[PDB]
Amino acid sequence: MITKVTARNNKITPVELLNQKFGNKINLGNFADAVFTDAAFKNVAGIANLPMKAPVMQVLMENCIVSKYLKQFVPDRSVCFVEEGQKFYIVLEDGQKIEVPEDVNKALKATVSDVKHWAGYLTEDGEHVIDLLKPAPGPHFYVNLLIGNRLGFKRTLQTTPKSVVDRFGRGSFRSHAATQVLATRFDMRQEENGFPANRQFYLYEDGKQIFYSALIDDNIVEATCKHSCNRTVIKYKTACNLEITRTIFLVPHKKGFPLATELQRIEIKNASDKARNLSITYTGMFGTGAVHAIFEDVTYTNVIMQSAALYNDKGEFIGITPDYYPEEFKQDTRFVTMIVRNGDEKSFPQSFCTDYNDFVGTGTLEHPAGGCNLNNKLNRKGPGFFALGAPFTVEPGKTVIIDTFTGLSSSKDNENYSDAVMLRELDNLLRYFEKSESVEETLNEIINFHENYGKYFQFNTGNKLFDSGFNRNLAFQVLYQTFMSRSFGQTQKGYREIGFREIQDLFASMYYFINIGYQDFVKELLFEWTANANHNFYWVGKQPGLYSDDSLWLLQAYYRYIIYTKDTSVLDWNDCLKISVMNAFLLKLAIDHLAEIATLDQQMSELSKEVTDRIQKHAWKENFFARVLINRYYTYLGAKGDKLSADPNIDGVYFLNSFAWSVLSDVATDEQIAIMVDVIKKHLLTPYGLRLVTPADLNKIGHYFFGDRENGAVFKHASMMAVAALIKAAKKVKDNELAKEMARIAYFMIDLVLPYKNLENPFQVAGNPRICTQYINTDTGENIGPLLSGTATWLNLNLISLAGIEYTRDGISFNPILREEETQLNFTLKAPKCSYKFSITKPVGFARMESSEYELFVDGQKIDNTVIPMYTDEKEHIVTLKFK
Amino acid sequence: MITKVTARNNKITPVELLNQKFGNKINLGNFADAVFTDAAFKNVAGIANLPMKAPVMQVLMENCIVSKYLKQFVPDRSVCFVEEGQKFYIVLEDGQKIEVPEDVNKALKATVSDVKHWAGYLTEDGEHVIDLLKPAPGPHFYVNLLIGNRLGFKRTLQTTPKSVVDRFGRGSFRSHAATQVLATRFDMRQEENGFPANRQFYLYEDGKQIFYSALIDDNIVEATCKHSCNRTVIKYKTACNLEITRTIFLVPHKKGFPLATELQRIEIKNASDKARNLSITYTGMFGTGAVHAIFEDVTYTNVIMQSAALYNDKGEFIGITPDYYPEEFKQDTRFVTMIVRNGDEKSFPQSFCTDYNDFVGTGTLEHPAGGCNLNNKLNRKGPGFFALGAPFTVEPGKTVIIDTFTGLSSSKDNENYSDAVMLRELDNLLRYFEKSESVEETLNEIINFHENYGKYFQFNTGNKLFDSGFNRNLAFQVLYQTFMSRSFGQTQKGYREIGFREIQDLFASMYYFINIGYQDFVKELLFEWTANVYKMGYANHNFYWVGKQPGLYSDDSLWLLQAYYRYIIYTKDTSVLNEEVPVADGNNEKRAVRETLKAIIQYSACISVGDHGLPLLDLADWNDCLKIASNSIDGATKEKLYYEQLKYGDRFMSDYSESVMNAFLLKLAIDHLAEIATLDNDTQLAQQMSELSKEVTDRIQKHAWKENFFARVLINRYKDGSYTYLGAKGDKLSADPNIDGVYFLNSFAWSVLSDVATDEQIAIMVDVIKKHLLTPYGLRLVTPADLNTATGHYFFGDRENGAVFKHASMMAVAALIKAAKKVKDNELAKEMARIAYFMIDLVLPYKNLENPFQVAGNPRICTQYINTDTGENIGPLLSGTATWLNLNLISLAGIEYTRDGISFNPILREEETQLNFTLKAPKCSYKFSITKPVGFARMESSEYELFVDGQKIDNTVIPMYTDEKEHIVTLKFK
Ligand SMILES: OC[C@H]1O[C@@H](O[C@H]2[C@H](O)[C@@H](O)[C@H](O[C@H]3[C@H](O)[C@@H](O)[C@H](O[C@H]4[C@H](O)[C@@H](O)[C@H](O)O[C@@H]4CO)O[C@@H]3CO)O[C@@H]2CO)[C@H](O)[C@@H](O)[C@@H]1O
Ligand SMILES: OC[C@H]1O[C@@H](O[C@H]2[C@H](O)[C@@H](O)[C@H](O[C@H]3[C@H](O)[C@@H](O)[C@H](O[C@H]4[C@H](O)[C@@H](O)[C@H](O)O[C@@H]4CO)O[C@@H]3CO)O[C@@H]2CO)[C@H](O)[C@@H](O)[C@@H]1O
């Protein structure tokens, strides 16, 4: 009797119904937004001719003038705007082209001003400049990830602090494990990582509120955000003529500092002719110690703690701390402090509030009722809300600098802990940043650390956006994922520890660490993983012996480390495949790796010959290597004749990782690779990339709609593993025509993963332009989070492998697979005791050493041997490759 | 180097520093608010002489005029306002009383206008009228609880819907178990039960936004909320001259309706001379099916679902539903619908939005950017946000009525479920409420159900606020807690099932149900609880659809007997005693009630006992924070380890700590079933238990009576014999230099309730109680104690560390009232009634409105405990307090059901001279009326005359009449 139309419908879209109605009459261009005027969907309102896909109608409807303008046409009939000349017209379906009124014309020119840049843009350094007024392509697009630095300090892996910062500075900030410094929010929307107050502040002038850092109002003229490598800067310009600048970053560790400390510097310049008397109120919510109780018992979280005030030597209030009664929540101690600088004169906040209800009162968080006058009451209960108030004058031209210090001390660093330990460490901190210049110096310390960390591998291509993306941005993400695994990002908030299989992240970061003299730290990591085999850990281990794969990955870390350093003085993967030929390929590589490890230190050389011939005989099911080999009852899963498909047109399930790992372990013969590549291109290759698996009815042996995650998505970690295999095969195989095709697919799939290209057509693609995301939805092509993904690790490994580098017993095996369009490729490479300056020239077309003729020069002299040795002479070597 | 001042460590308060500075100079009155002008706390700003404690300075600082006025005095020096004459003055500490400016005087008169009513007020019907502008005394004070009605439908207890509504209509709404219809919020603040959008709406006029139901702005003139029995009404009046009225209530169940449906009727009257063209946008967030994932994986909760639109026969959009992919989240199907009425013409919404980001846009939730023009896009992802838009004209004088229908259908009612089942049921619903009058009729159906449910017991005292509080409000809470236990309120949001020991709630509601002809439902409940008992005598600890954790906590089983006893005695219905009920042990096996009650007593008396005869404690008992014993055997560990020793009757091989509380429960359980068996025409089973109680009693009173007080846990486990017991003189377990031992209030209470303690023992325990357990804020649960290695979780005053726990303190009052009727000493009896009435005045919700910003709580609903530092009544609003407060007030009024009928023995207050109440029985009625002179009076001591329909009976027992006529009972104390 009653109908149900879901979002996924073979039905027509607004833009399709715009073309069906106005296609022949007006000129619509390559792109055009539109929206339905009614709930029955019979009519549309649209705008013709945009420079890209964008939600222009959405932003148009925010203007009241345009909404009320359409009232005399919609919803009874359909309409479309058209930009003939510089004056806008409205087209009715009954012919007439009416010239729109001047106020309606005012909006339409302003709205369609810079649609090509609505998603922001990248600098030459790969920083994302964002406009706070424009809409987001998705929940991760305007997000930045910050990280501390605990290198050369006790337990780096567990203690290094971490925080997430969106374009308005919103989010949350953590110390060791899941310990919250600022409150994380566990609500219905991805967009809300933190409690809304976190990091925000108000400014008042003579009683009235004139500013709120999370509210763009009529008084704000310019408002931009620049996300960069390990800091975020947000600028504003008011109509009243103030230039406000927020800078957020995490403090790197010094002797005697708190375990976790986040710094926000707020500059305020008075650009007008007269001086102004203002006041700041800085707000935020501390995270609870009793995180589980937020669900089981919110009233418990409130009664177990109380607010406390902090005072220096001179009896001056400096800030607020939450004080807990239970001993288990006393092992961490939080704080927030403020320091107002006014040229020479440092000062502290003169008022405070610690009850959200009292602070907001009659109003809202954007316009509190009790915001100017704070009541200075310490709350007997939680939650740990705070507001720190201070007045200041700013003379005309001069700038007032306000520095905040939110943070945490902990028993995990200090033996015999108490709140007294936090009090010592907070003093150290406030002493260190006494002088104003101190903060700008520590920032440049951070900036330089990363610029210098990235120097291990630097592409000098023509495309500046690729170079910065790889040299700064990707390098950083791979660093970030070494410490954090998949534990903390925008939407990744709940308890995921450090995962055993995220040792994978080390495979890429290892060479970067060693080359800034942290070979010690790389050893420290290896052993901490080696200690466990277990499936998870942080301080102690969780879900022990759960997954079959975990143990096997460890060998690949040791192998990579040992081979690079010559240091012998050291000694299932799919989370939705509940029912392993993959593990056979891991073990085979693990056996053959340790064979190479032992020689450098006959048992394993023989063993691999047995271990291989087990798989290739029984696991090779005619057309494709199997995935799960059932010997329990249905003979197998993952080939021709498994009898487990959910597609009339496809015979069987085909797992991409069965191909990938057969090649990576050197099991599959050239005949088998050429057969699997044809299977891959038929089914697993889509317009949006290589998908993880073909359709399959696992009920006879889901959670997501088709396209998301496991049900047929382009899972980018798995697809980068396939590219790793394709690149390996394109170097080795006999057939050059196959080699060409495998490199064709590798570079095709790389262009769908490189973050910077997300800014080409961003309201379709989304993702994040500086940070690799998890998967591409195969209905929309939308890059979906989280921002923590093995994609980056393997994207890093792959680009370098394409560039030619491959570390072996004798040194570097150099075998570059350039793009068919590229004629030049240049990159600097570092080694522990030397450097290299690589430079490859080739004619247009496919070229590799196994087929094409070439000359290979190292410091003049011309080696026919493709291996380049690891020099220890402390000098930049010039390597040149000329393909004929 | 750096100092740390905590809230509790902070020496002087602002009001104390106001008195230290202005005490001798000005007159400050009994009450006065103040605030510190600086962070060092050296100076204060205050207002002298308020009619009660109130946060007046807070509300004063919201006014900009007054904030800037103080800038020329604070923060360097201290200040106080004083109302000398009708002009306000500011007093400096350096003498001068300066007359404040006229704009500052304008505010101060307006602010201190009605401080006596800032927390609202109660009507004569016990409805709480609330002002949306004034601040709340606490997070539960302006909250109301709503409940559906599944009586005479499949699985009442599990399927009855429930919702919580604050003064702005904010909150969340649930169907069976923890299934969310509207989104619950699991955040940092108690104040936020729901997603903020839930139940709110906007109104627009000619492009602009002119209203938001959760924002009082300059355009709002009047804005009040009236919380009542099972509905909430919120009224507004705008400057532009609109009279907006929201009415929220849950629909009672009809044939073929959805399992859960919530109705909000929005009336909008145009009081002005000209007609207006407006539009409404109604918003809300559906609850996720994947509730766990909100914490573990928020992105999962979003991708597993998508929005869907609903259309009727005529191709007209009616509303929105969230559509899930996983089969496990397809077993419930949600909806929201709207119907705009404009006299004769009913209509549906013309637009919609389902992406929070698109709807809010550049703005905020209070002022969305995309609010007037909705984009009609179905979201491919969650979460389940919705906005339903409709235009309408309202002629001058006429009213536009908008009715919403948010709700849920489910497989738990319907066999072979799909989304098609929800679609059938939504049609039924929208057919039923087609006519406009229909909704006002179903409301009056609800109102009448409760007015008529309450008629079981009605006080007709002088105090109207007491009467309505007991007759309407308490009655309702006790109903609400029968269905919901402690599962769903404002702050009680996480998974708590139906607890076995919350059968206690039935003890009070039972007599109300039977007297509206739902003796069937009362039987249905009894059996559902009884089901969870095993063939042995132990039982499960909790349940919802299936029951779990058998014999885990030691008390649970024993409470069931008190339910059966109370039911049987009231109805004389031994036919329940011979009925077969599904066991929790194995197979599809039945056993008779007679043996299910025989086994329960046989377990706690013979099987699971210790050294000195009394029952074992296993893991724990009634106290949820008394974890002690090492290695506790489970109910079916013992059913496998009782078989091990033997290779009925003989005791279980252990030396575990014996719960002395459980000994009193078992003793009453044994003595109750003794009374049950005799009435079940049985001389043998009565003779079985009659002897048994004599043995069961003399076990306790000999070994458990530790000189000055009955013990709590009798530890019989340590070989060396250091620790002989817990809970008396000489236990050697106190954490107070000035007190010898731990003293548990429930050890007193249950010794009296089971009729174990002699009059000598009661008089001794009452002196112990008054020394330590009696505080200004009531009877506390236990004295300080180093039970050690677990240390405390709460500061002193909250919950377990020395709070006045009101469920436990009402159990103590039950004992005090019992003892005040029976005992020989009238001077003791007097004193025990003195304490009973003292503690009752700290629990009755209506008295919270006397000094509410100190006391908080909630004026219509009993809360959990009183903090003994502040006197603040702390939530949650679901508490055994109400159940026992109900039992206690009735027992004080004289009523006590026995074999022969009503044992009438009233303990009036010493101030009261009159007391009248109507009582209902299954086949008759009573009109009680007691007159006495000022002073203490009881039948055991004072002389009296007792009249029943004229004639004067010397027998104090009044029989249960079956003549269908109102009997007049009169008591005159000389
Ligand atoms: O394997 C590849 C890669 O995966 C990354 O792993 C992800 C998976 O991609 C993803 O499918 C999986 O998701 C969970 C989800 O987080 C849970 O919340 C959800 O829980 C359901 C449960 O399944 C139901 O039975 C129950 O009724 O409700 C709950 C929700 O309340 O289950 C799904 C899977 O079934 O999450 C994985 C991460 O945990 C990894 O990061 C990477 O290491 C892997 O290599
Ligand atoms: O006994 C009287 C009465 O109690 C009511 O029960 C309440 C108790 O009053 C209350 O003290 C208790 O509080 C819990 C709290 O809800 C839990 O969240 C919490 O959890 C801790 C845990 O203790 C730690 O070990 C762990 O590391 O962290 C979590 C928090 O993340 O534990 C406290 C107790 O210590 O809650 C009880 C409700 O279950 C009952 O309703 C009533 O029946 C009793 O008569």
Numbering used by the authors:
A (entry chain A): 1 to 532, 539 to 577, 621 to 628, 664 to 685, 692 to 723, 728 to 795, 802 to 984
B (entry chain B): 1 to 647, 653 to 793, 799 to 984
Reproduce the article's own wording on this structure.
The crystal structure of CDP from Ruminiclostridium thermocellum reported herein is the first solved for cellodextrin phosphorylase enzymes. In contrast to the typical glycosyl hydrolase mechanism, only a single carboxylate side-chain (Asp624) is required, which acts as the general acid. The active site of CDP lies at one end of the (α/α)6-barrel of the catalytic domain and the substrate binding site is largely delineated by the loops that connect the outer ring of α-helices to the inner ring.
However, when 10 mM cellohexaose was soaked into a crystal which had been grown in the presence of 10 mM phosphate buffer, a dataset was collected to 3.0 Å resolution revealing additional electron density in the active site cleft, which was interpreted as a cellotetraose molecule with an adjacent phosphate ion. The glucan was oriented such that the non-reducing terminal glycosidic bond was located between the phosphate and Asp624, the expected general acid catalyst. Thus, the glucan spanned subsites −1 to +3 of the active site pocket. The donor site is completely buried and does not extend beyond the −1 donor subsite where it is terminated by the side-chain of Trp622, the so-called “hydrophobic platform” residue that is structurally conserved in the close homologues. The phosphate is located in an adjacent lobe of the active site cleft that is closed off by a sugar bound in the −1 subsite, and thus must be bound before the glucan co-substrate in the phosphorolytic reaction, consistent with it following a sequential Bi Bi mechanism. In the more open CDP pocket, two side-chains from this “opposing loop” contribute to the acceptor binding site: Asp297 hydrogen bonds to O3 of the +2 subsite sugar, and Tyr300 forms a stacking interaction with it. There are no large conformational changes between the apo and ligand bound CDP structures (rms deviation of 0.692 Å for a dimer on dimer superposition), although a number of side-chains become reoriented to engage with the substrates. In particular, the carboxylate of the catalytic Asp624 is flipped about the Cα-Cβ bond, to hydrogen bond with O3 of the −1 subsite sugar and the oxygen of the scissile glycosidic linkage; additionally, the adjacent residue within this “catalytic loop”, Cys625, also hydrogen bonds to O2 of the +1 subsite sugar. Concurrently, the general acid donates a proton to the glycosidic oxygen to cleave the bond and release the shortened cellodextrin molecule. Consistent with this mechanism, we note that in the ligand bound structure of CDP, Asp624 is within hydrogen bonding distance of the glycosidic bond oxygen, indicating that it must be protonated.
